[PDB]
Design a protein around this ligand. Structure first.
Ligand SMILES: Cc1cn([C@H]2C[C@H](OP(=O)(O)O)[C@@H](COP(=O)(O)O)O2)c(=O)[nH]c1=O
Length: 129
């Protein structure tokens, strides 16, 4: 897998962000995660976490997996990086997302995220509290 450049257009919520990628606006959906909805416990905290991460970043990068790159809604499916730190992993490590939507070909970082989820769950963090 390889990181590619992108620039933030707008934070949206815990697991979606609008990025300019190859000079076109796209909504990206974070691979391998599921978050509480905006009116469910921790929904707002997930949105705030991802917002700060992407807004404070000097450099955002998009890393597609091996399989499909857009979903049925036209959203990009990627691992997103903020100054080299993966947003998908950080959200999970904080107990603000669960590992989810693991489709065979687009699961390169599954075990990395599952390790983060186990740590959040041992810590009883947030959704695991
Ligand atoms: C994360 C992800 C979601 N999706 C689709 C499955 C779900 O379809 P349904 O809408 O039919 O439930 C939807 C979940 O996204 P959200 O969690 O953003 O709603 O996005 C993919 O198809 N591939 C993926 O990798």
């Amino acid at each position: 897998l390889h990181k590619e450049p992108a620039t933030l257009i707008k934070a949206i919520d815990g697991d979606t962000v609008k990025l300019m990628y190859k000079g076109q606006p796209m909504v990206f959906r974070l691979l391998l995660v599921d978050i509480p909805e905006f009116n469910e416990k921790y929904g707002p905290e997930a949105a705030a976490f991802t917002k700060k991460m992407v807004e404070n970043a000097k450099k955002i990068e998009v890393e597609f997996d091996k399989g499909q790159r857009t979903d049925k809604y036209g959203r990009g499916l990627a691992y997103i990086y903020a100054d080299g730190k993966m947003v998908n992993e950080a959200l999970v490590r904080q107990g603000l997302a669960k590992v989810a939507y693991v489709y065979k070909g687009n699961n390169t970082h599954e075990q990395l995220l599952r390790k983060a989820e186990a740590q959040a769950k041992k810590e009883k963090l947030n959704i695991w509290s």
